[PDB]
Amino acid sequence: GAPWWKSAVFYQVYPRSFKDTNGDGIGDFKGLTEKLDYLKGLGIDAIWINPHYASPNTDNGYDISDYREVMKEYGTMEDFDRLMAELKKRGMRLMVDVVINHSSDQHEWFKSSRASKDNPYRDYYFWRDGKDGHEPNNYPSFFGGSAWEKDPVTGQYYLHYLGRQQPDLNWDTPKLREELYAMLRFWLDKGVSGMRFDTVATYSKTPGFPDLTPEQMKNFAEAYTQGPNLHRYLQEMHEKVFDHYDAVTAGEIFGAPLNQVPLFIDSRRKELDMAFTFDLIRYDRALDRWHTIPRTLADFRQTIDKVDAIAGEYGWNTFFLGNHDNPRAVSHFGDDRPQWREASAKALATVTLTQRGTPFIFQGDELGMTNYPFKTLQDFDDIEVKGFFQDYVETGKATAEELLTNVALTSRDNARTPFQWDDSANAGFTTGKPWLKVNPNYTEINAAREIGDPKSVYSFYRNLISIRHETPALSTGSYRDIDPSNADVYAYTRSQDGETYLVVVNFKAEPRSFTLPDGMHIAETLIESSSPAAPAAGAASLELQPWQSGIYKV
Numbered sequence: 001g002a003p004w005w006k007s008a009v010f011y012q013v014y015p016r017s018f019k020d021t022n023g024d025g026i027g028d029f030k031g032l033t034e035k036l037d038y039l040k041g042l043g044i045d046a047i048w049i050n051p052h053y054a055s056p057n058t059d060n061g062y063d064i065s066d067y068r069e070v071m072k073e074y075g076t077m078e079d080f081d082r083l084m085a086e087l088k089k090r091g092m093r094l095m096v097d098v099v100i101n102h103s104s105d106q107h108e109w110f111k112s113s114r115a116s117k118d119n120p121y122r123d124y125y126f127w128r129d130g131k132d133g134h135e136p137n138n139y140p141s142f143f144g145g146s147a148w149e150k151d152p153v154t155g156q157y158y159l160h161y162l163g164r165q166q167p168d169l170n171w172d173t174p175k176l177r178e179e180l181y182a183m184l185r186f187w188l189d190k191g192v193s194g195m196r197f198d199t200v201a202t203y204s205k206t207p208g209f210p211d212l213t214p215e216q217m218k219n220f221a222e223a224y225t226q227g228p229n230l231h232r233y234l235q236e237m238h239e240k241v242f243d244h245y246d247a248v249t250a251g252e253i254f255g256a257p258l259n260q261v262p263l264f265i266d267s268r269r270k271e272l273d274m275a276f277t278f279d280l281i282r283y284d285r286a287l288d289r290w291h292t293i294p295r296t297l298a299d300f301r302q303t304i305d306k307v308d309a310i311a312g313e314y315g316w317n318t319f320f321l322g323n324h325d326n327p328r329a330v331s332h333f334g335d336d337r338p339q340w341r342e343a344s345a346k347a348l349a350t351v352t353l354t355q356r357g358t359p360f361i362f363q364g365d366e367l368g369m370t371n372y373p374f375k376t377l378q379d380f381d382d383i384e385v386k387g388f389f390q391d392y393v394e395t396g397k398a399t400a401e402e403l404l405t406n407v408a409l410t411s412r413d414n415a416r417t418p419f420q421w422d423d424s425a426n427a428g429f430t431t432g433k434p435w436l437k438v439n440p441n442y443t444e445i446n447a448a449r450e451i452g453d454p455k456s457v458y459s460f461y462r463n464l465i466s467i468r469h470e471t472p473a474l475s476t477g478s479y480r481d482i483d484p485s486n487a488d489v490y491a492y493t494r495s496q497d498g499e500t501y502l503v504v505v506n507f508k509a510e511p512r513s514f515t516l517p518d519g520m521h522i523a524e525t526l527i528e529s530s531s532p533a534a535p536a537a538g539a540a541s542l543e544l545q546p547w548q549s550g551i552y553k554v
């Protein structure tokens, strides 16, 4: 038998933006608990929640000031316990986010570490002398300026790959590793079923902190994944923690070269169970992370083919088209214009739910939610956009208007607007003022209207999820791309135990034809979207409407 997580469908909840129950404009645990029936009815097996720990929220939960306490905005430990109990009543599982590349600068470890050079917490973090009058080296931060921040108390700099208020934890220090392992056991003893490791590839730092070369500077995210002790630390964590439990582990392998991914997920290596990779989701992103570079379906499918190959026999991939760090799937990979939004969102649901891997549906994608119409830079909450303002606008590299036009397409805030529950005030998300503005298209895109309509995006996701659950080949079967060079129609097979299925997805807003491989014929149509008629049993070809998708037994 294959482990449960290989055939599960996960849903990602960004709790801040899912459901508010107390008018403060921020989503909370009670809100999520009240919506479990909605997720159960969609067919979700497991939920991954973004970080839910005590946090000053300079990066919305990813700056944690106490790993053993819940975030004040989300509720109390009792609320979290109640969430767990209600998930369990429904046979559902919880995956939590684990953020141990860095902590908050408000964490008591860091308050102590920074206080002097000779204290027991000094080497919980990285403290270094500046060089030639400036920073220890030329490392940049993802969130703006240098990755090194001076502390006048000791006159040394501390390292922060992310924000200034997210100092990196020092995995080279054994006592620090032991603290992290104990903290993980604290949550696993509560029964959590999965853990997702934020920026898991950056834990090991390079000895001596030499300068990056000019080449490396342009792709610094990759350099940060090349620490010599990385796999040693991941293997130790598995031996001391995950060997004692029955939880699934998944790594956000951001910035690593694709050919190193098997090191994290080959089951023989006893590291992680599954990979989140970013080759596909960043396939059309410029190196600066805020421009977009036009790509075609041939690029999209060739990337998938490569990622599939690296899982091979002993590894396992997740599959996702959206998360809390990226623009909305239908806007990014589909066509979000009024006339094409529903058809292309369905086509993308078909893709997501028929890939070899564990699919993750990002909250609101089952409604066909879109990017937000930002008008000014003040419409963004996101600290990454403030950092681009700092690195590009303040330095005269770009104008504010150039930053705005381009980041409107790429910003994480596109994924973070409140979930659209119905057409009441604030889309039923809150009775107060939402922390981030609700998209005005909530009058046309909302759960209440979608659930009631058999022809909706929600209904199609629901139907695909049943089909996947009922068809073993569609989770664990082999994957074969019929024609990796085709830039119009995406077609592939899934097969297991002598049964083969064909998936065919038109990525053009125009009619297209499709010819099956010589010798292959349609046996049955499981489901189609935007199609006037199923093919005839025995068909050797298909006539596709704009954005038509389908699954066929062959």
Ligand SMILES: [Ca+2]
Residues within 6 Å of the ligand: 020, 021, 022, 023, 024, 025, 026, 027, 028, 073
């Ligand atoms: Ca609230």
